[PDB]
């Protein structure tokens, strides 16, 4: 009474998470001979999963 068993269990799990966030704000104002106003806004968002 011979027997012959073989079990080869394999489990692999990989997870990657990346997030990028960038924001820039600039404003300039000059009043003297003539009033001057300047505004600048920049926003960047990047996410990888």
């Amino acid at each position: 009474y011979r027997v012959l068993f073989y079990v080869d269990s394999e489990k692999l799990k990989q997870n990657d998470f990346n997030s990028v966030e960038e924001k820039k704000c600039k404003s300039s104002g000059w009043h003297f001979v003539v009033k001057f106003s300047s505004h600048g806004c920049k926003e960047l968002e990047n996410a990888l999963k």
């Binding site: 001979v33 003539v34 009033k35 001057f36 106003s37 300047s38 505004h39 600048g40 806004c41």
Partner: protein, 49 residues
């Protein structure tokens, strides 16, 4: 955003004034998400009696 104003007067008042305003805003968003899962096996049970 940009703005310019100018003012100059001289009595001999006289009157002169400039007023300007400019506003601009832009927003952009984009997302792409993909999920895939596959499994495929067999069970070839062969018995000889």
């Amino acid at each position: 955003k940009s703005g310019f104003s100018f003012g100059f007067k001289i009595p001999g008042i006289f009157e002169l004034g400039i007023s300007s305003q400019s506003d601009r805003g832009k927003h952009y968003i984009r997302r792409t998400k993909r999920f895939s899962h596959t499994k495929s096996v067999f069970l070839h049970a062969r018995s000889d009696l």
